[model samples]
Target: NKCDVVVVGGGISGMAAAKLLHDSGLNVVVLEARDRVGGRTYTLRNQKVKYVDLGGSYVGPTQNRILRLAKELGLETYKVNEVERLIHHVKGKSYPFRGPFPPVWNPITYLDHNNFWRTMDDMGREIPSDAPWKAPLAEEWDNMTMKELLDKLCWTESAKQLATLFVNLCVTAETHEVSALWFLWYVKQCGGTTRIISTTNGGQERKFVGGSGQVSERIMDLLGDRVKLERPVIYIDQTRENVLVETLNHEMYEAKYVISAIPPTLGMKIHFNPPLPMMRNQMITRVPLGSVIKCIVYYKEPFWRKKDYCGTMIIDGEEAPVAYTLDDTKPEGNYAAIMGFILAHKARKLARLTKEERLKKLCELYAKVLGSLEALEPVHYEEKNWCEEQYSGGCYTTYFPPGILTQYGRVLRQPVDRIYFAGTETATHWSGYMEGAVEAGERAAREILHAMGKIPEDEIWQSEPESVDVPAQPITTTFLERHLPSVPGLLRLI
Candidate 1:
């Protein structure tokens, strides 16, 4: 079958791109490997509880793209119940603390904490979102992992733990997994490290009344059968005229322009006939998706709330395999649950254990940390190990390791022949969040429109401007300037 565009992967990005193109009266077909719609944003709803997001759930105050779409889809959001205090669990000890920090259990300078995060934000502000590769420190920062970046700094144990927790919780990645340069770019785009990791004014502020996956579901409903399920793309053959996508099941799809809206890691799995450019292939191949296991333990009541506990816990080294927990209790409702992560190292550890053993351990930890004995016996339990999925190797989003982003990022979203790329990883702002996916999808759609001469050349996507010798100030800079320090000068202000 032939269409104006064949969107690959029915995640938020694919559905969004297809929706935009379809609305413009362009023929678009969406192929999804999964039986359902929402890719990494799966929502599991049943009689057990209101709903539990098996994937990306929260939307920050700054993530307006997703928020606007939620409004359009008639989805309601509620602020996550404020945590009274965070219970920091370390080796056999739990300390209750408040406000944007893990309790200092050891002798650590306040300077370590102050410098670590503040410096990250400063560095982040210097990297333009559109051309992170052109940052003054791009080569130096990109060659090192976040862990390496930290290693150069004299960090206290407390500071390291806090930073590690922030990265793991928000990015679903280890500090060692992400490049320092890329991490700075992410922090810059999301406003800052605090905004990206924070709940009050940050990305964790609110969640939908229904699950985040409902956003994708609503889009899928609007898309109808333009979205085909269980149609995994195995190969993409692009020529000067059009692109032909072949599925694993031997089904063939032809389109004037094809948008590859899957994860970079997943895209690496698909064969390209003429083959992707070496740089683009390297970008896709090197950037690995982060591992995460999202779990929800539903209780008969909000027992922790009654105990005056904030319902947020950060478990430190050797204390528990669970990294953190949040009150997943539905707002303005009766049911209660604690949602949390078994991430990176913990996820890998638990993967070897039996499901029963894993659930038992998580329940026990919840009981101890939430300070509620009732947490041991939940009404229901549910989880999703994203790495175990064939289509999605991991969750949250994919990240570049040291040096990859600088060397190959120029090709991240560039169209080759008739193929376009759109995914959360390719986003300029709010990357790794649903807002980023929306941004990428819409950007790709706009680019496709421009390519088709439907939109003027002035609107064409540019990694670097025609007139400028250096990269232009990112489009994200203006909207996010208030949240961040200042943008790098277009000509490097003297």
Candidate 2:
């Protein structure tokens, strides 16, 4: 089939791009690898738990793109309940500490904690969020891993563990794997170090009324037959006239432009005819996926609430397999659900264990984190091993190594010939989140629009987001109303 644009990947980004293009009177089609359309945003539903997200689930209150999309799709969201204190398990001791730092942090750890975060905040301002490579310190900062940066800052061993916990749990990789500048850029994307790391007022503040995957599903529903499922793209051969995309099933599709909206690691698997620029290929090849195994444990009721624990835990040095957990309860439901992530090296190690063994260990870890014996077992247990997904090698998003971001980061999103890129990882703001996926999709559509002379050059670029209101309408409206000059039909709806 032929269209104005062929979007590969049925995730938020491809769907968002296709939606914008289709509404603007362009012929667009979406090709998804799996039979499903949500990509990494899978919402598992069964008789047991109803619906539990196994992938990227949380949405910040101020994350603009996804919020506006949710509203437009007739979706509602609820704020994540704030916890009184977090159970910080460190070195065989559990500390239920309130406020920022854990109670076990010694003076040296305290100083390192403040110094590390403050340094990130300061560097974030200096390094351009959209173009960290353009920063004056880019070369120096990109050359070092976050761990190396911590060493230079004289971080205490305890402080390093805390830092490792955050990075592994949140970024899906250890501090030693991601570049220092890349870590700073991530904090900058979510506003600041504190905002990105906090649960009460930050990235983990809110979740959808249903499941996060609904956003992608709803958009896919609107897209209808324009979206093709179970079509895994294997080869992309582009020319000056049009691009030819071949699937593993030997199906061929053609389009004037193609948006490869899958993860960079997955994209690297596809054979590009004439190949990509060495820099672009290197960027895709060098970008490694973060390990994550997301699971949801369904209880008969909110038993942890009885203990006054919010189910948010930071398990550090406690010899537990799980890295972090959240209260993933559905409002108005009798059942209680808690989501936990087995992240980084632990996730890889746990993947080799039998399912029964993993579940037994997780149940024990759950009870320990909640500090309650009632959590010894749950009525239902569900999980998705993102590491095992054939199409998507891992979860969350990919990150740059010490020097790759500077060496080839510029081409991460830069279009190659008739091919364009749109994914969470390509986003300048809120990267690795649902918001960033939609933003990247919209941005890719705009780039194509500008290239076709359908929009003004001035409309093609935006500064990285700062923050937004609850509904995030201002941010969405600005992007929807102003730059989408080609899509008046859709603009009026917004």
Candidate 3:
């Protein structure tokens, strides 16, 4: 065998599994298609400012594993700007607003919680303490659209709009197709949606230090001789005893076990000898993970803080450059940062456009809200369009069309032959977020180690998460009334 184990893709999940497998004395090899590590979690530095996370940012309190791992590695973290910022739009009529201070259900709510908080509270309480993914929130709300839920609650059309904005902060899909149950499970899995509980973040979170790339670097730190960069695997041929991985440059390799950490979209594109069977092939193409372009901007100062703003921005309406804007530029007062998600569908058209053109268009839109926008130039901008990536194909996690989750979702995560699959998409509980990536990696590691006769299968059960009592009355309709009216229905939460 060319290597004891071949881990496909260089994302966090693959890196984590590689680390665990190698630490257990297994000679591990990592194949990364791109020149860089960190997958979606990457760092960007521009204009002599601080390092900014171009992909995922903002770590939450409930994010135990990643946070703990960061501290173990001696990294520090700060809050993701609790204050709310201004909102801007250009669908028909253009407008601007601020957040967190906005009352729940309050027409003028900016970033504050209210009815939305209340609904989150209800959802937090509704989720079972154990095995949250098995919950029926989506199944229950499957027939009803998110808009329908808003109406049942008697939310003002404006409140509904703000909910759309909140949703846009994470997801890249339209509200109707987006799952309410998924959101509910998200709230439940993350500890709770209360200001204290939700504000710190959990499952669907980002990090404060070097994005999640730091973790990738740490995982690969020990694999000095094993990690390969700029080596794209174009195909994999798995026989009963071994697997051969062929790179895009025509390099052929073999391994006893193949660990695929890449999203199946790209995984499917690779020709798998013995052909991955019928079920795996169909499941890979059908399970959809949408696309996103996370844009980062560097500015002279954290201007919004002096104004007592939350540092969050909601840009709604047709032709909106992003669904919601995050103040990723916090802590480093000298260099203010902003992150916007350009989801697929609309972004696909814009994706083909030049980044300079996209930035010019975005800044022009920001000018409508922040004012004196030309002053914010001399600025630096970075974009990560997940759709165009040969390895990932898109952003966010996998969502079964409707009925597929019951059948394919489970099948997708299960181990097959010597090929083990893991990623945020394979996550059973916190699927789709940073938490999901860690969860699947750890779980896959457990399964791999157990199969190799290194550890007991019950080791997984021993890693149960600490439980919290979900509070009630967190979402004040007053909160929804204030904030939901501002944003639109074009994205999903991460």
- Which is the leading candidate under TM-score? 2
Report the lDDT of model 3 for residue 122.
70
Candidate 2, pairs of clashing residues: none
Where does candidate 1 stray beyond 4 Å? 103-108, 458-494
Q: How accurate is candidate 2 locally (lDDT)?
A: 0.79
Residue-by-residue lDDT tens digits, candidate 1, 1-494: 88899999888888888888999999999999989998999888788775778898988666767777777788878878765776778766778877756644332345566667777877887899989999998999999888887766635666777777777776678899889998889889887876776666667878888898988889889988788888999999875466888997889998988998998878876999898888787667787888888888888887887776667888877547788888888886467888889988788878888777878888998877766679889788888899888887788888888888888889888888888889888898888889889889888998999988899876654332121111122222233333332112212343
Q: Which stretches of model 2 miss by more than 4 angstroms?
A: 100-106, 462-494
Q: Name the better of 2 and 3 by TM-score.
A: 2
Model 1 scores a C-alpha lDDT of: 0.80
TM-score of each: 0.90, 0.91, 0.80
Flag regions of model 3 displaced more than 4 Å: 83-101, 104-155, 179-187, 191-206, 371-378, 461-494
Predicted candidate 3 versus true structure: per-residue lDDT over 360-406, tens digit per residue:
87777665555545424736777778777666666765544444443
